[PDB]
Amino acid sequence: QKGPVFLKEPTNRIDFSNSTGAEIECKASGNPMPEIIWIRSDGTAVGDVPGLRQISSDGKLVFPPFRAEDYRQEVHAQVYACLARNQFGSIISRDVHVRAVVIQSYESEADNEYVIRGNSVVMKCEIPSYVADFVFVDLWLDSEGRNYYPNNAAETDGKYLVLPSGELHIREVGPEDGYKSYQCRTKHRLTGETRLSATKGRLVITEPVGSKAPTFATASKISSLLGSSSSDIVLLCQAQAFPVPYTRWYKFIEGTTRKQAVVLNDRVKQVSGTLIIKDAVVEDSGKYLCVVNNSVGGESVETVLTVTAPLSAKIDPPTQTVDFGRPAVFTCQYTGNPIKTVSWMKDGKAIGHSEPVLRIESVKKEDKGMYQCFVRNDQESAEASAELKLG
């Protein structure tokens, strides 16, 4: 009577510690009631692995907590999927990427910053790369016991500002800021446990002798970063000079040398030399230029920004009934950036068609069933289902 439709579809990424474990739930409607079958991305069904992987009584895929020595890649590092099958047909859920992580101790270091008097600075929380995925800055702390907290930047005024990217920004540092030592608290997403940095960083304020031209922390005149739509993005410009330089941001026109001055508003803001883009959208993508001038001279560093958007898929029509021999057409309406590939499936099998529109010119008894459109990134996947009825 009716094909399967996912009511609750597992997320693309499931990350958990070996201590917590995880349980993945998948549910779908239909008439008759579809059966839920957990599978790998390649389509094979998954069974119980003692102490490691279990199919629950309610149809949930479970990974109970386990010893680090019991780690298996075939289970814990595997990409899974949910299969909802019916007499009418079957559908496959978007890729479920399971990563079980054995929790391993780490140390964060707060770096010192050597500053020319009057220039603004940004303090970094150094996080070892192996925990870099699961660890972020909780807050900043100083020797006198003052707390600086992360905020979506509604108000950029004030001396100390914690950037959305986790660094601690400080306006116009004088000698009076040199008596403080700064420390950063890190938070682990999986364990929820907090840890202070092993090393306290502190500002070294050097009084300017003579004049100095703009000088960046690095000699690299170009870089890039990735960002999410609807998330607050930070473009850093790190330069020190005396007399204190002024910074302006420009945006190049696509495939052109020409560029426009970035317009600053209640969403796009500039804190000293740093640029913050709140509530980012895909169109913010492009090539940006930071220009730093002072009386003695000037420099320019470049940045390439790419703003990602979540993948979504919709098939028009959701349902259609065609007669034997007549054409049947499916149009996949998808969104999100970037898009690497489009692909189609029928009742859980690759149809070998990469175009957003799928058309069966002469329909047979075989073609009846559920159809799916799959859009994917390296990072992501999305799925939409549609049903085809005969007569």
Ligand X SMILES: *[C@@H]1O[C@H](CO)[C@@H](O[C@@H]2O[C@H](CO)[C@@H](O)[C@H](O)[C@H]2NC(C)=O)[C@H](O)[C@H]1NC(C)=O
Ligand Y SMILES: *[C@@H]1O[C@H](CO)[C@@H](O[C@@H]2O[C@H](CO)[C@@H](O[C@@H]3O[C@H](CO)[C@@H](O)[C@H](O[C@H]4O[C@H](CO)[C@@H](O)[C@H](O)[C@@H]4O)[C@@H]3O)[C@H](O)[C@H]2NC(C)=O)[C@H](O)[C@H]1NC(C)=O
Task: Give the interface with a second copy as residue ranges (CB under 8 A).
Answer: 68, 71-73, 76-77, 102, 104, 114, 128-130, 206, 209-211, 215, 217, 219-226, 240, 297, 304, 378
Q: Is the peptide bond before 64 cis (omega within 30 degrees of 0)?
A: no
Confirm or reject binding of residue 67 to ligand X (CB under 6 A): yes
Shortest distance in whole angstroms from residue 65 CB to ligand Y: 4
Closest approach of Cβ 389 to ligand Y, in Å?
Answer: 50
H or E segment and range at residue 31: strand 27-31
Adjacent-strand bridge partners of 82: 38
**Residue (146 or 221) nearer to ligand X, CB:** 221
Provide the minimum distance between the beta carbon of 295 and ligand X in the complex, in angstroms, as a whole number.
9
Among residues 32, 43, 51, 65, which is the contact residue for ligand Y, using CB under 6 A? 65
Q: Which of residues 16-35 bind ligand X (CB under 6 A)?
A: 18-19
CA 341, CA 213: separation in Å to the nearest integer?
48
Rg (the chain; Cα; Å)? 27
- Within 88-127, the residues that bind ligand Y by CB under 6 A are 102-105
What six digits make up the tokens of 250?
Answer: 């420009």
Residue 388 CB, nearest distance to a second copy (Å)? Answer: 36
Does the protein bind ligand Y through residue 265 (CB under 6 A)?
Answer: no
Site size for ligand X (CB under 6 A): 14
Task: Report the number of secondary-structure helices (H) and strands (E) in the chain.
Answer: 1, 38
Shortest Å, Cβ 72 to a second copy: 8
Instruction: Tell me which residue of 335, 354, 359, 336 sits closest to 344, measured CA to CA.
Output: 354
For 178, list phi and psi in degrees, rounded to 5: -85, -10
Q: Specify whether the CB–CB gap between 85 and 37 falls below 8 A.
A: yes
How many C-alpha atoms does 47 have within 13 Å on its Cβ side?
Answer: 2
Neighbours of 351 (CB within 10 A): 14
Question: Which 163-202 residues touch ligand Y, going by CB under 6 A?
Answer: none
Among 181, 300, 306, 337, binds ligand X (CB under 6 A): 300
**Site mask, ligand Y, residues 12-41, x = CB under 6 A?**
------xx----------------------
How many residues bind ligand Y (CB under 6 A)? The answer is 10
- Distance from C-alpha of 82 to C-alpha of 264, rounded to nearest angstrom: 46
Side chain identity at 70, as an amino acid letter?
D
| Closer residue to ligand Y, CB minimum distance, 161 or 190 | 190
Closest CA to 225 of 150, 292, 299, 277: 277
In whole angstroms, the minimum distance from the beta carbon of 137 to ligand X comes to: 22
Residue 52, helix vs strand vs coil? coil
Residue 206: contacted member of ligand Y, ligand X, a second copy, none (CB under 5 to 8 Å, by partner type):
a second copy
Provide, rounded to whole angstroms, the least separation between the CB of residue 346 and a second copy. 29
Q: Measured on CA atoms in the order 330, 336, 337, 341, is the torsion positive or negative? A: negative
Write out the residues near ligand X by the rule CB under 6 A: 18-19, 65, 67-68, 102-105, 291, 293, 298-300
Interface residues toward ligand Y, by CB under 6 A: 18-19, 65-68, 102-105
